[PDB]
């Protein structure tokens, strides 16, 4: 169907694709001459013909792939109809002809590119698929489901009474390949189509579930694993679909995992299946005692699968303190238990968990005594809500095993005491130190095995992290003499652990470690002067001891230590110990670090200038790129991109250190500000492939400015920085980042002061604010038959801050710009999060009688809000009514005095949750009483009074005691005073001057007696107040 010349030109080109020369010439020819408005359809026509008809595998394959790629880019929609049709017809004839399997696969994928919403109907495809599904050739059946997977909309197009049997036969097909493709197609439908379409295939789920036992009958567990993977996707999409056969699937996964002649894939995916219900349907799991019971049971079974064929654990005793990556099911079981416990709570799982543990702790099989320890370790955090109270009980089970004949059970027990020191902190440190420490300490002796000494030393890190110096104090000498022994090990990992454990114990001990400094420090210096991680962990230990004992003591070895660092730095795991150590010395040395900046800063400057290392990449070339932990690939705007992730993580780390030097050294860091701002902070906002970088760029901004301030350029840099921040608001996709930019502007404004913004900036900020609010609304009006966002609340919380901050810097002038997004604001005002936001904005508006334009638009809702069941709404509401009487005294009276009774009732309240809201109302009424002073029908003020003291909201308290400073005589006097003592002592707020005058009006003895109620500690404060 092409001119014969064109054919062998194109044939030559495509054949050249499979040498540099012949192949590059073809590549240029193709991309520069043939993929153009004029030749595109010829090219597509050619490639479709080759894929359809070529007798050569390679040419057919390549053309199928090329066609697929180019057909998108064209795109297929702007192709002439006569040519689309010819392409379609040959593609279809190719599919139905005799091709090798992999070519049929590629044809299927090519065909899919020719089916489209806007594209003319292709009912010949529909017909071809239906017939192929009945073919006696598996590859035809498989390939048809593949097309239904690529183009799930075709499933909508086929008659419901044809498509139903299609899938039922599919699930039941004698070919495994066909089954997997049927299942894949079936789930893909839900992946791709709206939920309103789901109910139409939903009904097939039981046939699918019913087909599952056949995989175990034929012994086809690998294919079972693949189906489990599809089913895992379906659970995440429509968990409730599973409700009616929930017990059946639970029981099935149970059966699989128990059969331990099966290979791991079926078993791990089956566990995953079970696990994922807790993440997507927690109420469904909780409403069924069976789920919990099965899930605990199976993970306990899998956790025992360790040191197989090695009862002494010889191999484990002889290795380092890392995981044996061969123990896969054991690793999976821990993670699963952990994940479900975190989702379901202890309320639901502790009982079934413990039912088993009581028994496994007592077994003669060591593997089960171990399993017990590791399971508790996995579940402890998730079950803390319950287990935090059964702490003596838990230690009673665990601690007796610390001395188990088997070293792995001992390690296991170490592990639990470690895990729970973290998960029940800080309560466990306070109450079980007397049992935990001796237990761990006893394992440290060189009598025990290296792995056990090491793990006990590790668990002392967990414990130390949350133990006060006073608790650790009596145990230090013993802890230390033991760890020195571990320091003398032959095994690199024991020394490494020893060092870190000492470091962290020293960190917790603080000044209590001063007496150990002289024994430790020289042992450490000797190690250093002599093995990279050793030296690093050693420098880490030295500098953390330094921070513990303080600068004066640290000064006995600082110069020598410093000289060693220098030698070490200028001589890759080590690099990170070095950088943190310098950083810790800066915290010790204070301003005396200044002369070290030339040594420490340059390396960080290099790393923090790292560029977005991106490789524009091809489909195939991307999953093996993905294998590396240090790389990731995404699809951004149509293309495939390879990004070097590690490098960008390192950029962040370096940015964080520069930020922390800047923070501590203030004015002394100024010399670096211009450079870090222009070469690091700002360019980092444009790092669209890594959000950490973007955020780290943002937080660096106000801190850099503030350094330069403390030491005109400042005004330039601020203008540049603010403008890119502002610009970022309207382009930044990620809500979490958007927040950082607003916050960052707030902090910038705070630094730069009065009138730090220009008119265009104020306008460009408004657009940003609006696009941010628009996209929040859109995401939120999306939140069921099939299924059971502080990120949003937090963003709006910060937007409030920036607006307020912008208002303040403009000194009101931002009212003008603020008007344009009033419709936006208004929608919000009339879903609680959006309401609170709107109210908060309006309170800021009134702060700057020019708002009458809107009195009518909001007081109806505000008055409503006053009596809302939600405390946060009442709070913001009352503040608004109070701010009305403060800044707009007269354009508001007809409202403020009526509502005043509402406020006396909202007041009645004094409880943590709403102490704040009732304090705002209290302040709100004091504002009204001020503005319209001798105009009120006065019980009121004596009501108000009984709402004192104000202890929680600071700005409220600030007004109430200002108003109190403008009740007399009587025996209100002790309530007058205490009202103030309480505010002061609670640190919530010259009202003192006023009080002294009242006490002046009474004798020596009458004056004194008021403080008679007050304890010593607050009488110390009172003396220093009056």
């Amino acid at each position: 169907a092409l001119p014969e010349e064109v054919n062998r030109t194109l044939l030559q080109i495509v054949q050249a694709f499979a040498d540099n020369q012949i192949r590059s010439v073809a590549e240029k020819a193709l991309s520069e001459e043939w993929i153009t408005e004029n030749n595109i359809e010829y090219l597509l026509t050619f490639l479709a013909e080759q894929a359809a008809f070529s007798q050569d595998t390679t040419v057919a394959a390549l053309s199928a792939v090329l066609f697929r790629k180019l057909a998108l880019k064209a795109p297929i929609t702007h192709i002439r109809k006569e040519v689309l049709a010819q392409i379609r017809s040959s593609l279809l004839k190719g599919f139905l002809s005799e091709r090798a399997d992999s070519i049929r696969h590629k044809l299927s994928d090519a065909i899919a590119e020719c089916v489209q919403d806007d594209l003319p109907a292709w009912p010949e495809l529909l017909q071809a698929l239906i017939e192929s599904l009945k073919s006696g050739n598996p590859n035809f059946r498989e390939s048809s489901f593949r097309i239904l997977t690529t183009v799930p909309y075709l499933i909508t197009a086929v008659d419901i009474n044809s498509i139903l049997p299609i899938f039922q036969s599919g699930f039941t097909d004698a070919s495994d390949n066909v089954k997997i493709a049927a299942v894949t197609a079936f789930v893909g439908y839900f992946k791709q189509l709206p939920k309103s379409e789901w109910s139409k295939l939903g009904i097939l789920l039981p046939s699918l579930l019913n087909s599952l036992p056949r995989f175990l009958d034929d012994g086809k567990d690998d294919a079972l694993a693949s189906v489990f993977e599809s089913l895992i996707e379906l659970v995440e999409l429509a968990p409730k679909l599973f409700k009616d056969m929930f017990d059946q699937i639970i029981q099935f996964t149970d059966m699989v995992i128990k059969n331990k002649d099966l290979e791991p894939p079926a078993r791990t995916t089956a566990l995953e299946l079970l696990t994922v219900f807790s993440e997507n349907a927690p109420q469904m799991c909780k409403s069924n005692q069976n789920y919990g019971q099965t899930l605990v049971m199976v993970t306990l079974i899998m956790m025992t699968e360790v040191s197989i064929d090695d009862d002494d654990a010889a191999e484990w005793i002889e290795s380092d303190d890392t995981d044996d990556e061969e123990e896969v099911t054991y690793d999976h079981a821990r993670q699963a238990l952990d994940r479900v416990a975190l989702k379901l709570g202890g309320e639901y799982l502790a009982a079934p968990l413990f039912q088993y543990l009581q028994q496994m702790i007592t077994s003669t099989e060591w593997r089960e005594r171990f399993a017990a320890m590791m399971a508790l370790s996995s579940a402890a955090e998730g079950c803390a809500d319950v287990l935090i109270g059964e702490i003596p009980k838990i230690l009673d089970m665990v601690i007796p095993l610390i001395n188990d004949p088997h070293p792995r059970v001992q390690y296991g027990c170490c592990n639990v005491l470690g895990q729970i020191s973290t998960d029940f902190s800080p309560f466990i440190q306070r109450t079980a130190h007397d049992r935990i420490l001796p237990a761990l300490i006893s394992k440290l002796t060189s009598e025990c095995t290296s792995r056990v000494q090491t793990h006990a030393a590790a668990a002392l890190v967990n414990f130390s992290e949350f133990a006060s110096k006073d608790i650790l104090e009596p145990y230090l000498d013993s802890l230390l003499t033991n760890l020195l022994v571990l320091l003398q090990s032959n095994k690199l990992y024991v020394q490494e652990q020893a060092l870190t454990t000492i470091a962290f114990i020293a960190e917790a001990a603080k000044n209590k470690f001063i007496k150990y400094y002289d024994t430790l420090m020289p042992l450490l210096l000797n190690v250093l002067k002599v093995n990279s991680v050793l030296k690093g962990k050693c420098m880490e230990c030295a500098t953390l001891i330094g921070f513990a004992v303080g600068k004066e003591k640290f000064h006995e070895h600082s110069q020598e230590l410093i000289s060693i660092l220098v030698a070490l730095q200028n001589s890759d795991a080590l690099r990170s110990y070095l950088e943190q150590s310098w950083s810790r010395i800066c915290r010790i040395l204070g301003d005396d670090f200044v002369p070290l900046l030339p040594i420490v800063i340059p390396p960080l400057l290099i790393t923090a200038k790292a560029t977005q290392d991106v490789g524009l990449i091809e489909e195939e070339e991307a999953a093996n790129f993905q294998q590396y932990p240090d790389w990731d690939v995404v699809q951004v705007q149509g293309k495939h991109i390879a990004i070097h992730t590690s490098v960008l993580d390192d950029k962040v780390s370096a940015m964080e250190l520069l930020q922390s030097y800047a923070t501590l050294l203030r004015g002394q860091f100024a010399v670096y500000v211009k450079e870090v701002m222009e070469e690091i902070a700002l360019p980092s906002l444009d790092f669209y492939l890594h959000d950490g970088v973007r955020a780290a760029g943002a937080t660096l901004i106000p801190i850099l400015l503030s350094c330069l301030l403390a030491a005109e350029e400042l005004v330039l840099l601020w203008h540049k920085a603010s403008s890119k921040l502002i610009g970022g608001l309207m382009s930044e996709p990620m809500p979490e980042i958007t927040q950082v930019y607003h916050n960052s502007l707030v902090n910038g404004i705070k630094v730069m002061g009065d009138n730090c913004l220009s008119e265009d900036q104020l306008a460009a900020f408004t657009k940003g604010v609006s696009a941010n609010l628009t996209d929040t609304y859109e995401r939120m009006q999306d939140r069921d038959e099939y299924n059971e966002d502080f990120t949003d609340e937090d963003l709006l919380d910060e937007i409030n801050k920036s607006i307020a901050a912008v208002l303040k810097t403009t000194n009101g002038h931002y009212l003008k710009n603020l008007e344009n997004i009033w419709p936006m604001i208004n929608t919000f005002l009339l879903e609680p999060i959006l309401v609170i936001f709107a109210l908060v904005v309006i309170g800021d508006l009134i702060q700057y009688e020019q708002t009458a334009s809107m009195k009518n638009a909001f007081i109806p809702k505000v008055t409503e809000c006053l009596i809302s069941p939600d405390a946060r709404i009442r709070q913001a509401a009352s503040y608004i009514i109070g701010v009305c009487a403060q800044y707009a005294p007269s354009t508001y009276a007809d409202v403020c005095i009526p509502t005043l009774d509402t406020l006396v009732q909202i007041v009645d309240s004094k409880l943590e949750e709403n102490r704040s809201s009732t304090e705002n109302a209290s302040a709100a009424i004091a504002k009204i009483l001020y503005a319209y002073n001798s105009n009120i029908p006065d019980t009121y003020t004596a009501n108000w009074f009984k709402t004192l003291p104000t202890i929680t909201d600071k700005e409220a308290a600030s007004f109430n005691y200002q108003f109190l400073s403008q009740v007399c005589a009587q025996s209100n006097i002790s309530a007058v005073v205490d009202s103030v003592i309480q505010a002061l002592n609670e640190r919530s707020l010259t009202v003192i001057s006023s009080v002294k005058k009242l006490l002046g009006f009474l004798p020596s003895s009458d004056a004194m007696a008021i403080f008679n109620r007050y304890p010593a500690d607050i009488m110390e404060k009172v003396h220093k107040w009056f």
């Binding site: 993670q335 994940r339 996995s378």
Partner: peptide
Amino acid sequence: FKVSKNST
């Protein structure tokens, strides 16, 4: 280092 639980 420490006692913790991975997640991979």
